[PDB]
Amino acid sequence: DEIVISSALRTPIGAFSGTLKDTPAAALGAHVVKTLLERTGLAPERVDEVVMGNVLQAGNGMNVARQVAVNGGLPVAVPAHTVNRVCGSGAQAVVTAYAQIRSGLSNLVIAGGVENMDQAPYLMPSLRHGARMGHTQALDALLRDGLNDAFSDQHSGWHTEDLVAKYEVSREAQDRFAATSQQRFAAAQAAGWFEGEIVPVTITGETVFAKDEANRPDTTEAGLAKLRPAFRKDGTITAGNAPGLNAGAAAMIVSSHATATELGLQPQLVIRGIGVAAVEPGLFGFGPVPAIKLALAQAQWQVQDVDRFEVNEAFAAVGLVVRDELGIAPERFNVDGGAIAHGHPIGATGAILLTKVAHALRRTSERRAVVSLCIGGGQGIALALERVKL
Amino acid sequence: DEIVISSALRTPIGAFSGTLKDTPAAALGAHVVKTLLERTGLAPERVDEVVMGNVLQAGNGMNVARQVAVNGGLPVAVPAHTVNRVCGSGAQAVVTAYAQIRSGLSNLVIAGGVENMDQAPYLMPSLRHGARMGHTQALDALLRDGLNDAFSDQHSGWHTEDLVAKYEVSREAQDRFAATSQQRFAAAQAAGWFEGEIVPVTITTETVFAKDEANRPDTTEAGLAKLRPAFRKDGTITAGNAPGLNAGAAAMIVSSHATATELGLQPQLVIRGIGVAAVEPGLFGFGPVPAIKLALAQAQWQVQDVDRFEVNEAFAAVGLVVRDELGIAPERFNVDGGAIAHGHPIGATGAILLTKVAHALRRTSERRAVVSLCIGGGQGIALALERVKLA
Amino acid sequence: KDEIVISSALRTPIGAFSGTLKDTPAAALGAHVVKTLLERTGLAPERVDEVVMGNVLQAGNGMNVARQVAVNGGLPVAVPAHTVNRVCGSGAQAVVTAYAQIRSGLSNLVIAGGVENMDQAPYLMPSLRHGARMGHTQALDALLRDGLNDAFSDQHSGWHTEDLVAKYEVSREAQDRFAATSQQRFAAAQAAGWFEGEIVPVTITTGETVFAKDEANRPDTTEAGLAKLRPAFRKDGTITAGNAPGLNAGAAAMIVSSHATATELGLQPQLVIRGIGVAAVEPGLFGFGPVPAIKLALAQAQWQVQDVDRFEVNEAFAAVGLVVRDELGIAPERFNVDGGAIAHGHPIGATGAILLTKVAHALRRTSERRAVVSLCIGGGQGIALALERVKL
Amino acid sequence: DEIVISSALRTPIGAFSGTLKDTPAAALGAHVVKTLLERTGLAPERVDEVVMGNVLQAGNGMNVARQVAVNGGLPVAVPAHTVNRVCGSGAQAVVTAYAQIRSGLSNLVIAGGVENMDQAPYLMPSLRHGARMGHTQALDALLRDGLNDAFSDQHSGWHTEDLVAKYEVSREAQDRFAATSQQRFAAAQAAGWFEGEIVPVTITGETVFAKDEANRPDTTEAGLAKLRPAFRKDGTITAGNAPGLNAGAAAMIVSSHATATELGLQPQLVIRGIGVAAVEPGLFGFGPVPAIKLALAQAQWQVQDVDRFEVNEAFAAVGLVVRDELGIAPERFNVDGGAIAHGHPIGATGAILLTKVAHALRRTSERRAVVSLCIGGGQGIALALERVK
Ligand SMILES: C=CC#CC#C/C=C/C[C@@H](O)[C@@H](O)CCCCC(=O)O
Ligand SMILES: C=CC#CC#C/C=C/C[C@@H](O)[C@@H](O)CCCCC(=O)O
Ligand SMILES: C=CC#CC#C/C=C/C[C@@H](O)[C@@H](O)CCCCC(=O)O
Ligand SMILES: C=CC#CC#C/C=C/C[C@@H](O)[C@@H](O)CCCCC(=O)O
């Protein structure tokens, strides 16, 4: 009755206005699901549900998860639903799957997340019943539904300056963390460490998109020191110590260990612990701390027991606060780099981080990992994960 | 370890361009949650999660469920997430809660759904990177993300004409079903049968909105026969045998029976069975049939054992196909009327139907009910529900 | 006999903002006036050399509003047409344009007027062609961007008029008195039937409604009620929704020709154009524009202010009426005698043609001999015509 | 009492999404007016009026002509108004000036036209009072207010296929006319023949925009034969035998000959005749024919007396129909190329064609020219023009 992750796969991550700008989030997910089914040879009839994270659902059409399922080639008999816990959404899909299997509602779920920030439409709140007289606003949905706090209407980056102030996170420390994320990601990418987990996407000439494109390998802390604050005049957060506005998808099979063995799957990770926590919306970057403590308590693990922490780099400041609050060794925190380098396709990111850890533990023979994401609105999600031997 | 529903409550349902047109879906949910907490006296710290259904999330701001939780007065320590299984979303929130409790992730969840179709914005897909030259479309989000099939871009009502054709559902039968829904709802409303489940909403313009406003009590099958088809030239589906574009919210506590007793709650329903099924998108109206069979199989019930079926009236045609395919007695199908009368606020409707059944079984002493909804894209959700006696 | 005359001046009633004409394009209002003008005059359509129409909010009205007015008005496709824009002066400019075409030998007979429908002005999306890229973007109300906001400052005409108020020491109390008097004079004139002769009713299909009476006026207006209103354009201002006109819709048109041409074709001339003035001033003091324009028109006519029976000066704001009246020393009883735009409305591009129409009919009724029509113009201009009644 | 054109000047013409895409039409006009005043040394107080053509007025702000005048450095005492006779607008501004001078309203007018088709906004007709339910359209103003017929809502190019059908204008003839326009324009441009009339524009790095950019010198009849019809499935009109969606401005001084001499101006052209005509909207391409006949009748000229015709290339098909109906020698029709090559910035084009002819007659010592434009909605405008020594 161990719940395991099998066949975790992801697209490469697109840059803002980059290679995936014309490819809907649901099409990215459908491509990963189609590929997962063809590579595993899993009988499509054994899929009980598709669960997908997606934050910017505006204009994506009815129920993104059902589009991912049907356009991914699954039989129309497979149900599907879409979950939204903001940046946690792609990890939430896997927690949702775990709950459905443990509760007896499902035996096997395809879970993941999708996002395409270019494909987020503009919103016209006054178009239905009229603006009447005077200028009116068209809202960028990626700000209104994705990155701005629902209570303040301030950017997540504006709020994170209060986390920076509270934990005395220097500009210099943020830029060092960001430069290190770029350097670690570039070295891992050059070593071929992401080839196994990436499903190339054909863009119609045809272009094969096979490599993460959002990263800047030549980044130095000295170069980052030159950038202007992006969110407050006297701020520390810049375009260089924050991730971009990215596109991508990831998906994986969630089942009991027995079900995976029965159907000839090769489990990658066992879910040993799950944590979901919430904090003040204004201090959302702290969310992973209580979430990780809950996941570690379920797994009966100490911080010192964990080979690697994979914590989303929503901002360098959030990575530093979570790492230092929990006393995690810098060499065991975002070992192969994070979202500052590869990008943060909101609803997909949690599924991407699970995918990275599945493949990294197999490569390194590391035994124990934690995946965690901070969540706009003041939440955190964490999974404690153990490598399954072949 | 029985999973029970306590303190199910709902707003009245707003008409399109009606009383709730300026009240965001998240504010409707927050109002229900705030009221549920004050009436139950439930310690807010005992709420482990808020799960809310919402289909038209466009322009509602970051994570509707978290807005419902925080604006409902729950501590910032209570996590929240939003689910979307289209018309099933408000029932899905309760299934999600059940799964979290049975799997040990949660002990007590506030679950429900919210929708406001007036508040759905228009979408401009070409505004980010430009239309360049030539006219461009601004899409109505309630069609693009709610009512149009994602595969065909045809209205759910257009697709339902193929269900009508396949099951030979006459225009006359659809209009009789619709007139009966209006008549049953009007009589139940006049008897005061919805007063207990409704939390009035104060609209500052202040006026108190306390009564469902979308229904048409004077409806007759003869009157409905005069209406033009809404979705196809040779169609049977009209504005009169389909629900409106409505607004509302509903929420309830989901917990083990033991947890409910421990915290001084009065359980209304025990969840005896859950069914989630999927079919051809083009025949989505059939979805409740396999879903109901799954829920009844988990409950070890036969159709004839059930006191009332509460099946969403997405169209009169869908109600008739589901009722007649399962051989349900017409007097036990949507007993107090359905969405044709009271409205279909998409993401809230499943939570509203659970709320109606919770209060109807208490009033009637009926023991066994099924709530089911068809789902755009070809799905169905069903819960088999048993009345819990007063302690 | 080579004197230039106005014949058969006619107008629609003026619609309120979000009122009876909200679904009727400006070009359709003009077409309706032209159709009626042709049937009442019996003018052979082939004798029309050109149609000139004022229109300020051209956005979304389709190619060349004047040509739509002409063709939809039932004129042969052989009749040329063009649209002029001198903002609030546009409807009077069309008549000056006609005068210049006739005096220069380009035309013998012109149908001139103006059209506007402020409800029908669309919103503009400047960022939709090439994209907003990231972050919120503005949809502009065209009636502000192209009609009422100054092109240099982007401030409302009403914001700028507060500087005219300061310079000419125009009290809030004086503005509210002027506004109350405009409402009272217009309501009395309307009730007496004094606008029935000049108005062409419009049938609106909804059932059908016959729109036959100006609807934008507020006869119950009091100085006490006006004193309670908040300043509309500056927090410590004097200009309010009550001492300014609305956002209105309407059309007017008339025949311009030599007196000899009018007689030849069996038309009944109403007015002789005795003088024309077009002037410009500081954009921020545009309300003063009529003063130099009126002086130019009076100089051409060889008239003194005291020779003029009535001044018809557009009430863009009560403040503008007061400045023009008091600067020229005009008797209050001879200034906007039958009320003005504060009461009946200001359908921008039509207003100048409406004021010429009002004066044509008022001089006939009263046997007054001499009038001046003048309008202030956003961007700092003024237009004026000195007009003499033609005897029958 | 001869009415003359002096100091005709223009910007280079921008391509669609090209160098002028961020520069408002009124700013292009202001730049030409500022340069005209510096070069002539004309006392700004001697300008009685500014008249500007502009067709896509949507979003340009209150009264484009007044913005051109004030931003061009004219005193606030100079009145200004904007005219719209669609593609004829830039020539109409000069006719308007002529009428104001002959009627005694004005002694000296700055007249011209401005257009920037990139800068034309999208329109939302349903945003004021609401779309209520169901998808709604955002209209491209350049189609709604500029290029689509107001009666049919069909593109001018769609209507011109009926002119093509009526006059049996072959695809091959249209592509030959278009290739010849490109070849003639490229050769004239390379010879420096447009340098005198062009006022360069600096766009902020900086771009110094000094040369027309919309033309395609490598155009061949063989290449044009490969293009798909743009307006009808079995049509003849393509992106290659029609002009683009362009930006530019032109302006000139209009006055009596005596006034020009008095103020030390150098007259370029005398207006000898003016024609304004109208036809069935769908066959608007024919409009120049009756308009040219009116202008020639006022000038007491025959077609054979005219050294060059400058007729707007709204479509190759329109140029061919006008040329062949009037029996004009192909070597005397759009001699230095036309809008297919250099572009058609709607409201400016008529003023641009007057500017081209002013400078071409000075260079060639040709005596007599006609400028004419077809006009959407079924109109035509023509001026008969004589070189001043
Ligand atoms: C749900 C928790 C969260 C979050 C987040 C985040 C951070 C996004 C970074 C962005 O705001 C900007 O830095 C992107 C700058 C865009 C630069 C560009 O134009 O591509
Ligand atoms: C997710 C499954 C589903 C569904 C559904 C549905 C039915 C919606 C009915 C409405 O589309 C129609 O009644 C149109 C409403 C007309 C009201 C109006 O025009 O104001
Ligand atoms: C060309 C020169 C000029 C001018 C002018 C003007 C009009 C000012 C009044 C308007 O701006 C506003 O008061 C209209 C108020 C609208 C309120 C409403 O109808 O809801
Ligand atoms: C007022 C009379 C007229 C006219 C006209 C015209 C012709 C317009 C040509 C354009 O429609 C064509 O260039 C098609 C536009 C191609 C757009 C592009 O460059 O992508």
Numbering used by the authors:
A (entry chain D): 4 to 207, 211 to 396
B (entry chain C): 4 to 208, 212 to 397
C (entry chain A): 3 to 208, 211 to 396
D (entry chain B): 4 to 207, 211 to 395
The authors write:
To investigate how bacterial polyynes target acetyl-CoA acetyltransferase, we solved the crystal structures of MasL in its apo and two holo (bound collimonin C 1 and collimonin D 2) forms at 1.78 Å, 1.66 Å, and 1.40 Å resolution, respectively. The asymmetric unit (space group P1 for apo MasL and MasL-collimonin D complex; P21 for MasL-collimonin C complex) of both structures contains a tetramer of the protein, as observed in solution. In the MasL-collimonin C complex, the conjugated polyyne tail extended into the MasL substrate binding site and formed a covalent bond between the terminal carbon (C16) of the alkyne moiety and the reactive cysteine sulfhydryl moiety of Cys90 via nucleophilic addition. Thus, the terminal alkyne was essential for polyyne activity through covalent modification on the reactive cysteine sulfhydryl group of acetyl-CoA acetyltransferases. In the further comparative analysis of the polar interactions in the activation pocket of MasL in MasL-collimonin C and MasL-collimonin D complex, the C(7)OH moiety of collimonin C/D 1, 2, His158 of MasL, and a water molecule formed a strong polar interaction network, including a direct hydrogen bond (3.00–3.16 Å) and a water-mediated hydrogen bond between C(7)OH and His158. Furthermore, although there was no significant induced-fit within the pocket, the collimonin C/D 1, 2 caused the Arg135 on the tetramerization loop to swap and form a hydrogen bond interaction and salt bridge, respectively, across the two subunits within the binding site. The C6 chiral center of collimonin C/D 1, 2 is critical to forming different polar interactions. The C(6)OH of collimonin C 1 had more flexibility concerning the spatial direction (with a dihedral angle to C(7)OH from 109˚ to 170˚) and built a sophisticated polar interaction network with the amide of Pro249 in the pantetheine loop, Arg135, and multiple water molecules. The polar interaction network derived from C(6)OH of collimonin C 1 further affected the distal carboxyl group binding model.
